């Protein structure tokens, strides 16, 4: 939903998004997945989450 | 942010490739790829901003 949300604003190629307001009940709803070793950005949070 | 390089090519992004606001029904074209050295273009004369009163 977050990706589709930022896609809704940045989809037309207009209005570059920045700054995200989250809710505490929605911060935990996000998965704490992290990029593997193979790809770059290794050891970096894939989502805002709440555990980091 | 729109990537500037893709597989060793030069990538530029603008609303001219389809001409969404300028054209009316839109061409529907999403991309134009090729040897852009084959197209010769230039300003034979380029004026600055002129104020007429």
Residues 6+ apart with CB under 8 A from A13: B2, B13, B15
Resolution (A): 3.7
Q: Which residues of A touch B3 (CB under 8 A)?
A: none
Method used to determine the 3D structure: cryo-EM
The closest alpha carbon to B12, from B20, B2, B22, belongs to B2
Q: How far does A33 lie from chain B, in Å, by closest CA?
A: 22
> Is A5 in contact with A26 (CB distance < 8 Å)?
no
Interface check B5 vs A, CB under 8 A: no
Which residue's entry shows tokens 């729109």? B2
Distance CA B11, CA B33 (A): 9
> Is B2 in contact with B15 (CB distance < 8 Å)?
no
What is the count of residue pairs from A and B with beta carbons less than 8 Å apart? 4
Distance CA B7, CA A15 (A): 27
Instruction: Identify the closest residue of chain B to A14 by CA–CA distance.
Output: B15
Half-sphere exposure for B35 (CA within 13 Å, toward CB): 2
Distance CA A19, CA A48 (A): 12
């Amino acid at each position: 939903d977050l990706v589709k949300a930022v896609g809704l604003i940045a989809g037309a190629g207009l209005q570059v998004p920045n700054g995200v307001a989250l809710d505490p009940a929605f911060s935990f709803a996000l998965s704490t997945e992290v990029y593997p070793k193979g790809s770059p950005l290794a050891g970096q949070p894939m989502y805002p989450a709440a555990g980091f | 942010a729109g990537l500037d390089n893709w597989r060793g090519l030069n990538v530029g992004a603008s609303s001219t490739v389809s001409g969404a606001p300028e054209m009316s029904p839109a061409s529907g074209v999403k991309a134009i790829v090729g040897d852009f050295s084959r197209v010769h273009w230039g300003f034979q004369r380029n004026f600055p901003i002129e104020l007429i009163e």
